[PDB]
A paper describes a structure:
Here, we report the three-dimensional structure of a ‘Termamyl’-like α-amylase, the AliC α-amylase from Alicyclobacillus sp. 18711. One particularly important subset of GH13 enzymes are the ‘Termamyl’-like α-amylases, historically named after an enzyme from Bacillus licheniformis. These enzymes typically feature a three-domain ‘A, B, C’ arrangement with a C-terminal β-sheet domain and with domain B being a protrusion from the (β/α)8 fold of domain A. The catalytic centre is placed in domain A, whilst the A–B interface forms the substrate-binding cleft. The fold, as expected, is a canonical three-domain arrangement with the A, B and C domains defined approximately as A, residues 4–104 and 210–397; B, residues 105–209; and C, residues 398–484. A classical Ca2+–Na+–Ca2+ triad is found at the A/B-domain interface.
In order to try and access a branched complex with a branch in the +1 subsite (the position of which is harder to model from the 6-deoxy sugars present in acarbose alone) we sought to obtain a complex by co-crystallizing AliC with 63-α-d-glucosyl maltotriose (Megazyme, Wicklow, Ireland) and observing what was obtained with this active enzyme. A ‘branched-ligand’ AliC complex was obtained through co-crystallization, with crystals forming in a new space group. This form diffracted poorly and data could only be obtained to 2.95 Å resolution. A subsequent lower resolution (approximately 3 Å) analysis revealed the binding of a branched ligand in the +1/+2 subsites with an α-1,6-linked glucose branch bound to the +1 subsite sugar. Weak density in the −1 subsite, largely diffuse but greater than would be expected for discrete solvent, remained unmodelled. Notably, this +1′ sugar overlaps in position with the very recently reported SusG amylase branched-ligand complex. The accommodation of branch points was therefore investigated by an analysis of limit digestion products (the characteristic oligosaccharides remaining after enzymatic digestion) on both pullulan (a regular linear polysaccharide of α-1,4, α-1,4, α-1,6 repeating trisaccharides) and amylopectin, an α-1,6-branched starch structure. The action of AliC on pullulan results in the production of the trisaccharide panose, glucose α-1,6-glucose α-1,4-glucose, demonstrating that the enzyme must be able to accommodate α-1,6 linkages to glucose moieties in both the +1 and −2 subsites.
Numbering used by the authors: 4 to 484
Write the structure that this text describes.
Amino acid sequence: GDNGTMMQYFEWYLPNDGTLWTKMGSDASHLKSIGITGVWFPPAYKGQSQSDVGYGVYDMYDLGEFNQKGTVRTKYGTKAQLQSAITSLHNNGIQAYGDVVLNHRMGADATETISAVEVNPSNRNQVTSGAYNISAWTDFEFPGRGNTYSSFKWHSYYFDGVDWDQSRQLSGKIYQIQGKAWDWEVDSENGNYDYLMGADIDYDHPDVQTEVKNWGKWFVNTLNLDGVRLDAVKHIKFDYMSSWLSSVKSTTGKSNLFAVGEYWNTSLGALENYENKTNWSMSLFDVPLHMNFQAAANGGGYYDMRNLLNNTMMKNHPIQAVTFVDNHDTEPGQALQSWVSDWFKPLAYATILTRQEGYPCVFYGDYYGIPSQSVSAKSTWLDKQLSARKSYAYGTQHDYLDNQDVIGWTREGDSAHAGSGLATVMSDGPGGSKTMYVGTAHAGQVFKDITGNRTDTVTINSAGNGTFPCNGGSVSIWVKQ
Ligand SMILES: OC[C@H]1O[C@H](OC[C@H]2O[C@H](O[C@H]3[C@H](O)[C@@H](O)[C@@H](O)O[C@@H]3CO)[C@H](O)[C@@H](O)[C@@H]2O)[C@H](O)[C@@H](O)[C@@H]1O
Ligand SMILES: OC[C@H]1O[C@H](O[C@H]2[C@H](O)[C@@H](O)[C@@H](O)O[C@@H]2CO)[C@H](O)[C@@H](O)[C@@H]1O
Ligand SMILES: OC[C@H]1O[C@H](O)[C@H](O)[C@@H](O)[C@@H]1O
Ligand SMILES: OC[C@H]1O[C@H](O)[C@H](O)[C@@H](O)[C@@H]1O
Ligand SMILES: [Ca+2]
Ligand SMILES: [Ca+2]
Ligand SMILES: [Ca+2]
Ligand code: NA
């Protein structure tokens, strides 16, 4: 067993040129050489416009195959182009995880007149008006697809709520459809966080429950997926999501189907809750670790690096942790902007890539850069960290998370991977050394900094210890020369 490494193969500000699937296909053998074992690709189905990033879901049966919303292709390309890309990933032994967006729909084909009440955006449980008629965007007819793959049409009675009355056109409102209840169990911020945006799917209605589990089967079968990435799980009835996932595993026979959910909450408690209510059947993005990386990045050297891993899925539930530094939602100008500055980013990526805890995820925005926000590509130095992970980050780990500035850990090596073993050392502050145990096995061997940040070498004494230096505000990853 080789280490596993995910890559989010998109960012928010990609150009709308229908080329991402093409590119992903080409990149397959390159991704294999740098140690990517799995690729998370963005919502592949038709959004409300050609340029939609994917979260403005229109038709989940249109993988850029049908002419709807004025385009055949999605922002990313055609069903044909996606299938070639997935084949190419598979030919290079890389897993394909599809982004699955179940919370809502938008770009309804027409309005329906329906009775609804206003609820309080701070407390969706509290009603704030009498019933009355609104013009709600709840009619999904799918005219360019007709009945190919599914004749299921969405109407008002399949949604719990909307944020727009077309007849009166008012901001700041959340409408609950008459005789509907916000689903449960959901995140309890705003009393009930079932409603986020668009037309909120009612996961109480059992026609919806069995249609969405069919969609699941069709999606995973049609693209031959190894896994799913689940958008907005905090806003979706936990029991249904737990059964949605075991239904798809069962109906497809992919019973080892990988699943990671976006539960966006800075509190480990909330995440633990979601895991408990879903039988630990899926992993979660380590959002608390991301927040810690940001705090250290903005600490100007004064963050207490001993606390870097506190209150994280990485430390506390490593088998269900998907670790990340930044994503499409945290990048500059997006909704959860919490960017990790350039100087700290290598310390963060060294943390998720050289430690035994977590399934780490490399951001496309980091690897290839974000031109629209003047972010350099980090590919040159990331390649060296990914080399460390692929070929050296193996065997017993020893942790030295024991100073405000300088911290480190070692990996002894396993016999399965030749020459394997490393010592990672990093400082949020001035440069220094740590004496750490890499194993008596390595005695007399000479270590180099695979990052290139330092040109000196460390000789391992016969007790199996080295004294490993790093630069100020940098990281060095030491391996057998
Ligand atoms: O119209 C609704 C909303 O849309 C965007 O929000 C995007 C993100 O919403 C969720 O995250 C919320 C957190 O769960 C709350 O803790 C708090 O921090 O607020 C954010 C949203 O502002 C969701 O879980 C993420 O996947 C979404 O991308 C807009 O930016 C909001 O201003 C709108 O209210
Ligand atoms: O008729 C124009 C356009 O109106 C809507 O766009 C809304 C959106 O739905 C609301 O959720 C909110 O953000 O205000 C926007 C203001 O323009 C419709 O949803 C859309 O289908 C329609 O074409
Ligand atoms: O954390 C487990 C993951 O590790 C690796 O990428 C495997 O290839 C994948 O199947 C597994 O789901
Ligand atoms: O906190 C609000 C919640 O209280 C209870 O748990 C109800 O069962 C649920 O339907 C409601 O929204
Ligand atoms: Ca409901
Ligand atoms: Ca919802
Ligand atoms: Ca410090
Ligand atoms: Na709902």
